[PDB]
């Protein structure tokens, strides 16, 4: 019994989340700080799982183990509200997302069946320095919580959350950030996905989108057509020499928002250096040889469930887009062109940061369902979407 809307979660009882150091859904926060003090002694034993299941840390360096995690997520991870599409994170993408600088093996927390060794559960943590209003804290980002469909509704998720919390406490970290499509106590910000059609015909045949009332298929295709090459002078793929200036541009650009990452130069290399079918970053090198802007988006296809002909939807996701001399509008226009060129069906972006200044103008359509942002063990006022400056995978 999850809840997707904010007053529909008001009518729900949070058996697990009431035990956790997060503000209450009804609470209004007029303070800044930890919900509870750091614990100076941490439980040494893993939480007990139901009979027949065992903890196992996943060495994603082992190709076979990574493939098992890919399959668990491919078959059991997040679906849309209509049960028509499911995320299809690739093995190489998962390596990018789960082994950034500072990753730890015990933070790749798997659950297996004792008898068959089948992987049936997972949760992960990666370290991240997080700027939240006037405070900068070392935290973890929690992602990829997944319970096999046959194991659902058996209170396994609370055990995964408690166990990753324990393993993070053991390393001296007491705050986390995470996002979810469901409402939990208590969102620090609520964002919304918008979508930009790139291959409208594919998207309508698979019922990802639909013909708007009184608009034909030929008009819709014409409406979404794009130039074949980008417009901005000096746009080119990010290279190794660009790492310091990309770090500099991002650091200065993020100061205007209230929830942001604080990345080292090594983390900027990890998150932005282009990897085919994972992450794309283009910089603008101007007529003086200076890099003044960059755009980026990551690759995340979805399975199209129960369709005889179309099996996968190739989606691009807006990542971080920094502008200091090129208009954001022109930057995102080139991102759409580049995505189209690279074979993507759709371009997704949230309404956070300054994205609302281009969403409507570039013919994005609003999606359904939100993306809620949460902090664990940190009290602070909520913020509008335009002040969220954090994008997770």
């Amino acid at each position: 019994g999850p809840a997707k809307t904010m007053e529909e979660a008001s009518k729900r009882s949070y058996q697990f989340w009431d035990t956790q150091p997060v503000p209450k859904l009804g609470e209004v926060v007029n303070t800044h700080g930890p919900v509870e003090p750091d614990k100076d002694n941490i439980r040494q034993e893993p939480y007990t799982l139901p009979q027949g299941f065992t903890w196992d840390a996943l060495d994603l360096g082992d190709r076979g183990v990574l493939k098992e995690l890919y399959t668990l997520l491919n078959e059991n991870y997040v679906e849309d509200d209509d049960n028509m599409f499911r995320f299809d994170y690739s093995p190489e993408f998962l390596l990018w997302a789960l082994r950034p600088p500072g990753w730890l093996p015990q933070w790749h927390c798997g659950v297996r069946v004792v008898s068959s060794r089948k992987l049936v559960g997972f949760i992960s943590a990666i370290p991240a320095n997080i700027h939240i209003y006037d405070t900068e804290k070392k935290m973890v980002e929690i992602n990829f919580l997944c319970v096999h469909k046959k194991l659902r509704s058996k209170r396994v998720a609370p055990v995964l959350i408690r166990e990753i919390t324990r393993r993070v406490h053991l390393e001296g970290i007491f705050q986390a950030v995470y996002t979810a499509g469901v409402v939990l106590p208590k969102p620090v910000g609520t964002c919304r996905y918008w979508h930009r059609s790139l291959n409208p015909r594919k998207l309508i045949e698979v019922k990802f989108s639909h013909l708007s009332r009184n608009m034909t298929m030929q008009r819709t295709m014409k409406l979404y057509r794009l130039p074949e090459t980008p417009k901005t002078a000096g746009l080119r793929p990010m290279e190794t020499k660009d790492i310091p200036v990309v770090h500099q541009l991002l650091t200065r650009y993020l100061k205007q928002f209230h929830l942001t990452p604080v990345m080292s130069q090594e983390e900027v290399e990890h998150w932005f250096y282009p990897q085919e079918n994972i992450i794309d970053t283009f910089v603008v090198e101007n007529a003086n040889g200076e890099v003044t802007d960059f755009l980026s988006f990551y690759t995340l296809p979805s399975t199209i469930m129960n369709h005889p002909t179309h099996k996968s939807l190739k989606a691009a996701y807006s990542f971080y887009n920094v502008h200091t001399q090129t208009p954001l509008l022109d930057l995102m226009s080139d991102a759409l062109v580049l995505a189209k060129m690279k074979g993507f069906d759709v371009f997704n972006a949230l309404d956070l940061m300054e994205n609302k200044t281009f969403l409507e103008k570039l013919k994005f359509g609003i999606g359904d369902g939100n993306l809620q942002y949460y902090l664990y063990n940190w009290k602070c006022p909520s913020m509008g979407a335009e002040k969220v400056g954090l994008v997770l995978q």
């Binding site: 997040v78 679906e79 849309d80 509200d81 209509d82 028509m84 599409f85 499911r86 995320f87 992602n143 996002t179 979810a180 499509g181 919304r192 996905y193 979508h195 990802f208 989108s209 639909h210 995340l300 979805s302 996701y317 997704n348 359509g365 609003i366 999606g367 359904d368 369902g369 939100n370 993306l371 809620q372 997770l392 995978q393």
Partner: peptide, 8 residues
Amino acid sequence: AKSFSKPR
């Protein structure tokens, strides 16, 4: 990503 969306 985490929340699967489609145009309303």
